[PDB]
Amino acid sequence: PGSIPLIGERFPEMEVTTDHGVIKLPDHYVSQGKWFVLFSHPADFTPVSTTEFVSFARRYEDFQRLGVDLIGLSVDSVFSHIKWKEWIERHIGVRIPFPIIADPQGTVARRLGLLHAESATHTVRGVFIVDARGVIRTMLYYPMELGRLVDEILRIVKALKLGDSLKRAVPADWPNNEIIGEGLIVPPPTTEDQARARMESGQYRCLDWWFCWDTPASRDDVEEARRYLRRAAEKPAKLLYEE
Amino acid sequence: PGSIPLIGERFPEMEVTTDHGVIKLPDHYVSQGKWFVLFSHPADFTPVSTTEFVSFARRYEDFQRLGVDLIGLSVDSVFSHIKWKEWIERHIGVRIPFPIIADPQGTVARRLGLLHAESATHTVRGVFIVDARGVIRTMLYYPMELGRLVDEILRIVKALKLGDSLKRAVPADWPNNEIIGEGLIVPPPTTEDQARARMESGQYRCLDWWFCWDTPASRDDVEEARRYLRRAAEKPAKLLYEEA
Amino acid sequence: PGSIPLIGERFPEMEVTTDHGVIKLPDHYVSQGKWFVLFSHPADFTPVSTTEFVSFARRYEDFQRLGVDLIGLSVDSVFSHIKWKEWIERHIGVRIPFPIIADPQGTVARRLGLLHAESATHTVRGVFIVDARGVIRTMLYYPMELGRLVDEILRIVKALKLGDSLKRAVPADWPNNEIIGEGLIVPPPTTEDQARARMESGQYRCLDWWFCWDTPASRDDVEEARRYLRRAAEKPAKLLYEE
Amino acid sequence: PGSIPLIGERFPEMEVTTDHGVIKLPDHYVSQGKWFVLFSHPADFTPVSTTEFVSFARRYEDFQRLGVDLIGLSVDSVFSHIKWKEWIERHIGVRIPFPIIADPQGTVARRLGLLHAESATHTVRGVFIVDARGVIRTMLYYPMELGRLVDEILRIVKALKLGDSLKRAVPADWPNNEIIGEGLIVPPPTTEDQARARMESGQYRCLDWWFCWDTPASRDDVEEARRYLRRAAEKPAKLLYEEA
Amino acid sequence: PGSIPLIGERFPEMEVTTDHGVIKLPDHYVSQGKWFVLFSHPADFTPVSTTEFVSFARRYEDFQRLGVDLIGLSVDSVFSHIKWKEWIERHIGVRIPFPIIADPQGTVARRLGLLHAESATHTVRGVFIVDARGVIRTMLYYPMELGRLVDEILRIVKALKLGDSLKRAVPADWPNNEIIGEGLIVPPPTTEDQARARMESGQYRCLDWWFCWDTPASRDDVEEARRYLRRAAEKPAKLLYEE
Amino acid sequence: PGSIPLIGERFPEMEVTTDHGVIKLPDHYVSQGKWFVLFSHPADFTPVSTTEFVSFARRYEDFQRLGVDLIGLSVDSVFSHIKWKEWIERHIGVRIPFPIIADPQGTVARRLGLLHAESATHTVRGVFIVDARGVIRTMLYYPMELGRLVDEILRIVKALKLGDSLKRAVPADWPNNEIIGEGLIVPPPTTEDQARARMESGQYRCLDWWFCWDTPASRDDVEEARRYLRRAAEKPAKLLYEEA
Amino acid sequence: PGSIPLIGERFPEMEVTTDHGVIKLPDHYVSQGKWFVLFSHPADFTPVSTTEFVSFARRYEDFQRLGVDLIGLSVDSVFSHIKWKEWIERHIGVRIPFPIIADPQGTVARRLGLLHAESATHTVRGVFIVDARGVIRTMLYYPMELGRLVDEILRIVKALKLGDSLKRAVPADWPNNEIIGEGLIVPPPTTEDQARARMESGQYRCLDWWFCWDTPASRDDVEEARRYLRRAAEKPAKLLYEEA
Amino acid sequence: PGSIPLIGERFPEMEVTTDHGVIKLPDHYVSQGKWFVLFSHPADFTPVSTTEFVSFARRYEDFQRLGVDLIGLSVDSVFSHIKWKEWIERHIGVRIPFPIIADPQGTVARRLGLLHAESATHTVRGVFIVDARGVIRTMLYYPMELGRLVDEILRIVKALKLGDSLKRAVPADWPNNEIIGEGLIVPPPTTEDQARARMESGQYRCLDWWFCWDTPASRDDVEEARRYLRRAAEKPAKLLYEEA
Numbered sequence A, C, E: 001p002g003s004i005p006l007i008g009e010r011f012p013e014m015e016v017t018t019d020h021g022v023i024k025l026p027d028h029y030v031s032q033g034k035w036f037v038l039f040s041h042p043a044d045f046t047p048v049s050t051t052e053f054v055s056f057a058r059r060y061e062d063f064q065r066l067g068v069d070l071i072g073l074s075v076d077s078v079f080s081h082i083k084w085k086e087w088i089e090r091h092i093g094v095r096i097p098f099p100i101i102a103d104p105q106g107t108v109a110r111r112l113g114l115l116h117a118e119s120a121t122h123t124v125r126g127v128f129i130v131d132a133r134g135v136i137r138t139m140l141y142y143p144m145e146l147g148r149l150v151d152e153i154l155r156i157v158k159a160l161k162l163g164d165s166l167k168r169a170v171p172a173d174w175p176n177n178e179i180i181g182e183g184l185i186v187p188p189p190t191t192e193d194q195a196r197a198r199m200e201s202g203q204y205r206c207l208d209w210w211f212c213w214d215t216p217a218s219r220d221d222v223e224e225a226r227r228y229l230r231r232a233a234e235k236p237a238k239l240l241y242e243e
Numbered sequence B, D, F, G, H: 001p002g003s004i005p006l007i008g009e010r011f012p013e014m015e016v017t018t019d020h021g022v023i024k025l026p027d028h029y030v031s032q033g034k035w036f037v038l039f040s041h042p043a044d045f046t047p048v049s050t051t052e053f054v055s056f057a058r059r060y061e062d063f064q065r066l067g068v069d070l071i072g073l074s075v076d077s078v079f080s081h082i083k084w085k086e087w088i089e090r091h092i093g094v095r096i097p098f099p100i101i102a103d104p105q106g107t108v109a110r111r112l113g114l115l116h117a118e119s120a121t122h123t124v125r126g127v128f129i130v131d132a133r134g135v136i137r138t139m140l141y142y143p144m145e146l147g148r149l150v151d152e153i154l155r156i157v158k159a160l161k162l163g164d165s166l167k168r169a170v171p172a173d174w175p176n177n178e179i180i181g182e183g184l185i186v187p188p189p190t191t192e193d194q195a196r197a198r199m200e201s202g203q204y205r206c207l208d209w210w211f212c213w214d215t216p217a218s219r220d221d222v223e224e225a226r227r228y229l230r231r232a233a234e235k236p237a238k239l240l241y242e243e244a
């Protein structure tokens, strides 16, 4: 039994303490016309969490390019956050450029339903994808033992942004959908007159009045989405621990 | 906001109606010693949902090899479910093998918290990964407008099973983690004594006492997990609409 | 054990989604001066329901002739409603001209008390006859296993309209009542004063001061009603099954 | 602002005072293995109600032919019921053979959701069809100003009894349905396997797997039900008011 | 137990349906400067009730001269009331001139505490005497099996009016009280100074400072009151039955 | 408004203090198979009250002959009750033989609803006729300014016991009813059969099936009742204030 | 607004996670017949908190001799606790030998009222002294900006112990009280007979019947107590930062 | 447990009765720009309490030098307060200069939660340090059997005042800290940028970015603070009881 915010709702208003200072969410990013990915982890100085922060750091530029910032969250204090970041930079050679929220009393975790049955003291690995209007668009709740696949989070925001501007719905596994590949779906008619006209228009390739699509996405947009997936599928040429 | 089940909790007992008959959850699958992925979609005869079922359908064999079952869910009735399936087999050429739950009154939906602000009438694209003990292991909530990445659902299950059998935690992006590649993490010590013991054992490659790992996964484990991502990243050979 | 709206009550104001679009009840029909028959059925792609829709469809011009609209309702989505109508037109050779409300979550079903002990998920075969003032005039509840007799619904709107227009009550089995045939009943006196005055005027055929009647209904109105019943008793010469 | 018992629920157990005496519902009828139709009317000594009582009385044997009893209801006392019955027999020539419940204070009325917005003091023209198990099978609510069509009430209990005994659903306007005439409908498949089996058996005429029917009703069952409708459609040969 | 209005309270304001039409109580009578007696009976077409109605009807002229109206009440409909009045006028030869409230549902009965332990469906034989100010002056509650003595009701009203106009209290059995006969009582002093003054005045015949009286009621008034009682005591010369 | 026990209920069980001693109602009278009239009056040493007590005392023999005990009630103490009783025996020459409840604080008055608007401090002139079973049979509420007619209270008791013994209803103005004189009414049939059986037997005189009566009461019983009415109507030959 | 446990009450029973593992309080110390001092600090890697742990650590053997154990507490996790302790040992050259409760979510902090208006997320510098019976004996609440005087905590436990065994009360500034020196107070008389007895006995030096005392403490006890204070007064000869 | 005021919160506003008159807290001291130490004790004419008052009196000048006032508190009346003071002055020879609040009924006692489990009638030995803004800075709760170390209350106040003036945090045991002696700690950075800016300033002496300090306190400040501790560890030259 847990209470989580919902897709479609504005991200709960709240002032938080990060290792970059105090900021108000989602105001802080909305004001910059930025989307933001809020993600949490159990505790500082933990292995899986470290691999995740490093993964986010390496992909940071990719997020910035999409006008998407990142912000972390754990039940630890800001001193530990900073110490942990120093450890990471010193031993892994990677600098974490984004802020981490320090939520000592679980206030934030509770408002976001990040505390599950696994642990009553530490948050699981949740992910909130909020858009430039401060509206929650997607929620993922990974557990303590499983690290996230950061490239899917990039594919999600990218797909969301494309769907938003092109006024299209996105098929499964896009841009590599088995049925229409990189095609994007035209929102289904909701009335008999609409369906009738959708077919009469014959302006799109259709499988039925309720299944039409086209290919309005830029070739660069597609290639970029494909880049995320190929990076996820590729075994790294050099492993960081080797230094 | 809304209420949802939680990771670590046993799937909420319930009797549900599907196009394959009435079944109790999670007993139906727990009793078979099988994990099950419960996913929902807004409604039958909708585009994104269609592509997602086809995707699950084609990867159905991959879920079987892992001992995992699929079960869908939407507010539509069984008659619509069955007709929609017939439309897909006839027009796309793909037979949907797994059952779909009919939840006309949102009963199940409310229990699993699948009804968000994006519509008080239809469910979002939720995903519940439940292990063979009926325990919720992972939850994903996608919106109406974005289709899911089924191969990632496959990676989640395989990794979770690996972690269970090897007593290891799985690093970000496994089996292609930028730091330790395909290695698996050893649960960190939680006391000073355990911390000292770990270090003085020299039993693992370690970056610090709280970060040790090895590579206990078999080549098969690693390669199958990787195959999932490779497929997701691969540009389709031939599209299914072309001869539909 | 199920609260419902009542005869004499204004129809529960509500905005509903139908396969013809979104409309507000009862306003949509009131602003047109139309009576409307809202009826429900358990689910799309079900036998009995299909026959009832075909039957309503065939009697459509009859309702339209009277100034009465039709509007169905079930828990299925608009997508299923449209596919179901397509199947009907293709296989029965009959097009469904009226809209069908999509009520997943059964919000409308609840307000109208359409969910009974039989099923907790699908509505029974309910019928609400509402007039051009948006007032509920009659309600009928048929079970899943029994298809309605559409011609009786035509008799009802026909009779109620006449009564309102002629300011008369309609006897049982009209227009073939065993006692006064196609006669119509004059509303009974409510005071001794009135009773004496009516029996005094000798203005109507009367059995007692509380039972007077005349025959104000035009020949055409009487015949239209008789036609409804005659159709209900006539065995079809050709079954659509064979089309 | 209204509340009523529901189809599928057992008729609310209650002891009622009628002009034939006090009886226990629905037990009185259930113990005889008889179905019963309970209907109410506004008040005694009112025109429409009189024509209706005469209509039921003239068809009383038809209900007895179906093992169905009748019992009326109004907020009037037993004394009025009896006096009113005296008037009908004396002035119209028909003896009301069934009992009427006297519900002053609207106790029964309220329990059956019979008091509507139209009138706060008098019940509307409600109709409850209850089977030999004491279960409500159908409910109809007619207004003060419109008299019921008794023959349809006959078609209903007749069709319900057949659907029950033959395990079939009754199509619209039966036995004169415009699609399968007097054919009775086979309960539709709820699962895919059932659907496929239903189609391969070829033991029924079908438009689709969810729409199959056959003609199991006897010719007598069919003509009798059609007779009810034929009767409702016939203009009287002799108006009772004449030799009244 | 139950709840009834109280002596001294205003008759509970209400609109009522009678067989003479709708009327508001007590306003309808207050406005005419008339007192009114409201009495109930269990049901129409019942023996005792019928005898009481014939008795009221016989004394109608007596109440009328006193400026008192009559109105009955039962849970039967207005239709039963008219038929019941017709039965009495035809089979007894007496016409009931006053209205009868039709109270199905027992709405009024509850307001006046007329439903007792005897019957939960029918009203007992209650009697409410209301003056011109619309004030309840006396309440009687007779059982089902016991008809009322209408003459005592007239005595009550007569005495009550005299007391009001004469500023006097009425002794027991007036006008035939065993101590002062037809004399009326002077309201007793309530302070020591009054008890003394009343005594030092010698203006009234007194047994004590608190028991003084005189004879202010005219012969006519006294005679009318005795008339009421004489009639109650007299054995009927002819019986309406034999006629 | 106010709460009051009802006709048909058993008199509210209570222990009361009287100027004759403490007693329990209605047990004190029930146990000795006696009926009892409980009447109240505002306060001791008040004129109208004094006249009613004298009136009651004068009729004590008649009430006793019917097996009816009397008992008064006011909010004064037992000390005033006795002084007032002494004043009456001395200045009126009449001795009050029945007990009087002393209800300071109005506890008993509240239970019987004797405190109306007129006075929140003193009780009105209530009357409670209670039978040998402890059941309330009639209730009269007279105001402060109007003394009761004690002879009608006698007629009521008399009519009641008679109705109870002969199993008959008592018409208005009995025993001088205008329609049936000293006749007593036979409880009306409540069912169609009963109604016909009553008519078929023609064993009673009847105006209709619901109005039958006979003359079962003895001459002595009838004459006693008329005696009460004759006294209420007779002008006093000797006024007690003079004989004083 | 805040609620804290109280002197005289038993330390709230609870299971806590420390960097030494899980232990039950106060049972874990009670079962050993030991007294324990629970103290908290805002967060790991903070300056004053570090100077404090180093101070407790230098005095560890002293608490040891008294049969007193130490246990710290902050809202940080065990990983930070262990990392922080390594930092101290590495840079100050001092090893912290006692456990630190890791109270994320502040469950423990809330039951002990350790969260004040200063910070809603971090605890102040509280100290709970609990005896071998598990009863809270003293509570000190220092702020974020003020480090504690650890020697006074030792003076408190020592004083309490002598008080308990010698059945005496401890004067202000003991063992250097301006009035009676190292003397201990004899619990005063609570009754007049006691006061008089106490006085005519003359066994104690008294200023009045309510102020008597003696010198029951041994020189070692007094010496030990004075040692705590001398150290508190003395300025370290060697500052640990010099060779850090 | 129980409820108490919290550090950070403004002292509960109230009007209290002292043996010096009626004053409002904390307004009376705030308005003078003074801090005040509120301490309580169980009852007047009790040994330990007496030693404590004597201790505070002797140090009254030291508190005054710092601009800090003293005010006591107990459930006794003002009369006992004054009689008790007269006793101490004539028998011990020490005048108590500060006021004492008289709280019979324990009103103030509850507001400050000074009633613990041992006694439900007398306050325990509490201490509240309040600054010139009326804010609570520190709270100490000593038991009945243990007298306070007044010199530590002095060290707490002066340190707290230094910290505010110098914008510094005070290390454990200051001015005799084992790590930095009489140096004061600079408030730690709370952001990555502040952290790097501090390390790049070489402005102070640091063990790490979060542990930097300097020695801004004047020698006077340091030695006066050390003097307090030196006095506490010093065996009195002459005991006051010796000439009482």
Ligand SMILES: [O-][O-]
Residues within 6 Å of the ligand: C169, D042, D043, D046, D047, D048, D049, D050, D144
């Ligand atoms: O009933 O008209």
Ligand SMILES: [O-][O-]
Residues within 6 Å of the ligand: G042, G046, G047, G048, G049, G050, G144, H169
């Ligand atoms: O702790 O500063």
